[PDB]
Each structure stands twice: as C-alpha cells, then as structure tokens.
Amino acid sequence: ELQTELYEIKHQILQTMGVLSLQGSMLSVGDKVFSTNGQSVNFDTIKEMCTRAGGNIAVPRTPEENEAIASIAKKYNNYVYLGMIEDQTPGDFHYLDGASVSYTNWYPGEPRGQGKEKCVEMYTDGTWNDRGCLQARLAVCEF
Amino acid sequence: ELQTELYEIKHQILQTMGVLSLQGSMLSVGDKVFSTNGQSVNFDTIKEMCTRAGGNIAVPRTPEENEAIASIAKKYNNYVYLGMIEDQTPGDFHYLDGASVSYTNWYPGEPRGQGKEKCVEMYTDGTWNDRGCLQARLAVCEF
Amino acid sequence: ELQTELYEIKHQILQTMGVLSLQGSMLSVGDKVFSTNGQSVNFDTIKEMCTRAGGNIAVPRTPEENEAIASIAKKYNNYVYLGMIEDQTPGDFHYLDGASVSYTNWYPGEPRGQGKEKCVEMYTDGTWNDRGCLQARLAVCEF
Numbered sequence: 001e002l003q004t005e006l007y008e009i010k011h012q013i014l015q016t017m018g019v020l021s022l023q024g025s026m027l028s029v030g031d032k033v034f035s036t037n038g039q040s041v042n043f044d045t046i047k048e049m050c051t052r053a054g055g056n057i058a059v060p061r062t063p064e065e066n067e068a069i070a071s072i073a074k075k076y077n078n079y080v081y082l083g084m085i086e087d088q089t090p091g092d093f094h095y096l097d098g099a100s101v102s103y104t105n106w107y108p109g110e111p112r113g114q115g116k117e118k119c120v121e122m123y124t125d126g127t128w129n130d131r132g133c134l135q136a137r138l139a140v141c142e143f
Numbered sequence: 144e145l146q147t148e149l150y151e152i153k154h155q156i157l158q159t160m161g162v163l164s165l166q167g168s169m170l171s172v173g174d175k176v177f178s179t180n181g182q183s184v185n186f187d188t189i190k191e192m193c194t195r196a197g198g199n200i201a202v203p204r205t206p207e208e209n210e211a212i213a214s215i216a217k218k219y220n221n222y223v224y225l226g227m228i229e230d231q232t233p234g235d236f237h238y239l240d241g242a243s244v245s246y247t248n249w250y251p252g253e254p255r256g257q258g259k260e261k262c263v264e265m266y267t268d269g270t271w272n273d274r275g276c277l278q279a280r281l282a283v284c285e286f
Numbered sequence: 287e288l289q290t291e292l293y294e295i296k297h298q299i300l301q302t303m304g305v306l307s308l309q310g311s312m313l314s315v316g317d318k319v320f321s322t323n324g325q326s327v328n329f330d331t332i333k334e335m336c337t338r339a340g341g342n343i344a345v346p347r348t349p350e351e352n353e354a355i356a357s358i359a360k361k362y363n364n365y366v367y368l369g370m371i372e373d374q375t376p377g378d379f380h381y382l383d384g385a386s387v388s389y390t391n392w393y394p395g396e397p398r399g400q401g402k403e404k405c406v407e408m409y410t411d412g413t414w415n416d417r418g419c420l421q422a423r424l425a426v427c428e429f
C-alpha cells in the first residue's frame with residue numbers, strides 16, 4: 001500500500017504549490033509553471049538563469065499560457081523575451097529545440113524586423129513583437 | 144524498486160517545505176499548512192484567493208491549529224476571517240461545507256451579534272468574534 | 287501504472303524546486319539544499335531555527351557544498367556558523383552527530399582558538415575560522 005504514501009505525497013506537493021501560488025511566486029497553467037526572478041536582462045542571460053533553475057525561458061503555446069505570461073509582464077511593467085528565435089528566413093521563427101512555432105500572437109504588422117530582429121518580446125497586453133536580443137527584458141521561466 | 148524513487152521524492156518534498164517554513168512563507172501543523180498573501184480584504188475576496196491557490200480560507204479545528212493562525216494574525220498585526228459562517232439560527236455557526244462547528248475559541252461573551260454578524264474573525268490573541276463579512280481582514284489560507 | 291502518477295509527481299517537485307531556486311530562496315547542491323532566513327543570531331538559536339524547519343544547521347562536506355554556503359555568506363555580507371563544534375581536545379572538531387569532521391577549509395593558521403573557540407564560522411571567501419558560539423551570524427540551514 002504505497003497508495004496512502006502516494007496520497008500524502010500528492011497532498012504535500014499541492015500544499016507547497018498552493019503556498020507558492022498564493023504568494024504570487026509562480027503561476028500554474030495546466031502542467032506548466034511560470035515564474036520570474038524579477039530581473040531585467042538580455043536573451044542569453046535569461047536562458048542561463050532559467051536553465052540554471054532547471055527550467056527554460058518561457059514560451060506560450062496556448063492562449064491561456066500567453067495570458068499567464070502577459071499578466072506577469074503587466075505586473076512587473078516590462079516586456080518579456082520569449083523562448084523562440086528567428087530562422088535564416090525572415091518571418092519564420094522556431095522554438096529553441098528547433099521546432100517550428102505553432103501558436104502565435106503577433107501585434108498587428110509584426111513580425112517585420114526584416115530578419116534583423118531575431119528575438120521575440122511580449123508586450124504587456126500579451127501581443128508579440130520581433131526585436132533585437134540585446135535589450136533588458138523581464139526574465140520569465142517555465143518549468 | 145520504486146521505494147528508492149519514493150525516498151528521493153519524500154526527501155525533496157521535505158526540502159521544499161523546509162525552505163518555505165524556514166523563510167516564514169507558511170506554517171505546518173499536522174497535515175495542514177497555513178499561509179497568507181499578506182493582503183487585507185473581505186470574506187468573499189479571501190475565499191476566492193484561497194480557492195484560486197488550490198486551498199481554502201483557514202479554519203482551526205484544534206488548539207494547535209488555532210494558535211498557528213493566531214501567530215500569523217499576531218505577526219501581521221491584523222484580525223483574520225475564519226472559514227465559517229452563521230446559520231439562520233443566531234449563535235450557531237457552520238464550516239463552509241455545511242458541517243456544524245466543533246472546536247471553538249470565542250472571546251468571552253461571543254458570539255453575540257444577534258444574527259447580524261454572519262462571519263467570524265480571530266483576534267491577535269487567538270480568540271474569536273462574530274463580525275460582519277465586509278471588513279478588511281488578513282487573508283489566511285489552509286492547504 | 288503508478289509510473290505516470292510518479293512522473294507527474296516528479297515533474298511538480300522539479301517545478302517547485304525550480305521556482306524556489308529561480309527566486310534565490312535556496313541553493314541545490316547534489317542531494318542537499320541550503321537556505322537562509324536572512325537572520326543573524328547565535329549558534330544555539332540557529333540550531334533551533336533549522337530543526338524547527340525540519341532541517342539542520344548547514345555543514346559543507348565537499349568543495350562544491352562549501353562554495354554554495356560561501357555564496358550565501360557573500361550575498362548577505364555576513365559570516366556563517368557551521369554545523370560543527372570543538373571536542374575537549376583543542377584542534378579537533380566534530381559534526382553535531384558526534385562524527386569526526388572530514389572535509390575542512392580552514393583559513394591559514396586556523397583553528398587556533400586554543401580550545402576557547404568551540405564553534406566554527408565561515409568567512410565570505412569560504413574559509414573557516416574557529417570562534418566563540420555567542421556571536422551574531424547568518425543562519426544557514428541544510429535540508
């Protein structure tokens with residue numbers, strides 16, 4: 001009967017996640033958890049911070065996930081670098097694993113950096129803009 | 144041998160709970176965890192905050208649990224709305240699931256709102272007072 | 287098939303640990319987690335704080351663990367009491383379980399308290415110094 005042990009384990013996990021959620025330390029959406037260290041740095045620096053914590057730079061794949069990151073962007077009053085970069089072909093973006101981006105939420109007219117804006121930033125309203133990768137942006141990670 | 148996997152899992156849970164406890168993010172009493180977002184709002188707002196985090200507005204059922212919530216009330220220097228409301232019959236209170244309240248810690252003379260004070264607040268010394276549900280009170284949740 | 291349940295459980299644990307790590311609430315090194323409440327008190331007080339959180343006053347047993355505690359000492363700009371005390375024989379130190387200390391990182395010339403410095407403090411560079419147990423030092427716990 002590890003079930004009773006499994007019940008206790010599940011209970012305690014919900015407790016810790018409950019505490020972190022209640023205190024605004026993270027946002028849970030489906031099986032994904034978003035969180036920020038509150039720091040504003042560039043793309044490469046964000047990537048390192050997220051991977052060091054055992055996670056990855058956040059990327060929304062659903063409207064719900066997009067709205068979650070947006071709320072964090074809104075809360076900290078800063079744009080957010082997302083986990084995707086531009087191919088050699090302008091207008092085409094891929095996740096960091098190489099896969100083609102599916103869900104998008106570009107601000108009207110974007111992307112239009114003409115291949116000179118490799119990264120993607122999220123505005124506080126949740127819409128996307130392709131941008132240079134060297135700006136100071138809120139570090140948001142997914143786990 | 145999932146036991147060794149279960150040992151690692153139990154260890155990591157204790158670590159995270161240990162960290163949260165050490166930094167005062169929550170209080171553990173038996174199988175119950177209490178926590179606050181530090182905010183002072185009304186009863187309905189507290190209920191929503193707690194349920195959104197996957198928990199419930201706190202309610203003590205033992206002296207130990209009561210003292211835990213009291214310490215939080217004391218720390219934040221504010222009274223706490225508890226998870227119970229008054230029936231149609233004055234003087235009789237029930238938990239939010241409908242069940243009759245068992246453990247009580249009324250301040251001497253309370254409850255005496257004559258049915259016009261549906262909610263229950265905890266003083267910083269841990270004693271209870273029946274009160275209106277529209278005041279600004281420290282949000283404390285249980286998980 | 288508790289495996290799928292075990293996968294979910296492992297995932298959620300990594301999420302919570304990821305959040306705590308990302309926000310600097312703790313440092314993970316191997317199977318050990320270090321954390322501080324930011325408070326500066328004496329040896330006996332630290333011991334109580336750590337055990338109350340279900341952990342123990344930190345003690346490094348590897349260079350990696352030592353560097354982790356050092357970074358915390360460096361961050362909070364304060365020396366750290368470590369989990370060991372001196373025997374009746376000067377120069378010989380033991381962990382709190384009684385076992386003889388193995389890994390050491392004494393500052394050159396230390397320990398030289400001549401048996402009048404029972405405790406051990408860590409400098410911000412990570413090196414050790416034997417010291418009296420009544421000073422105000424950063425409380426760092428391991429879990």
Ligand SMILES: [Ca+2]
Pocket residue numbers: 110111112113117129130131
């Ligand atoms: Ca653009």
Ligand SMILES: [Ca+2]
Pocket residue numbers: 253254255256260272273274
């Ligand atoms: Ca009253």
Ligand SMILES: [Ca+2]
Pocket residue numbers: 396397398399403415416417
């Ligand atoms: Ca010395």
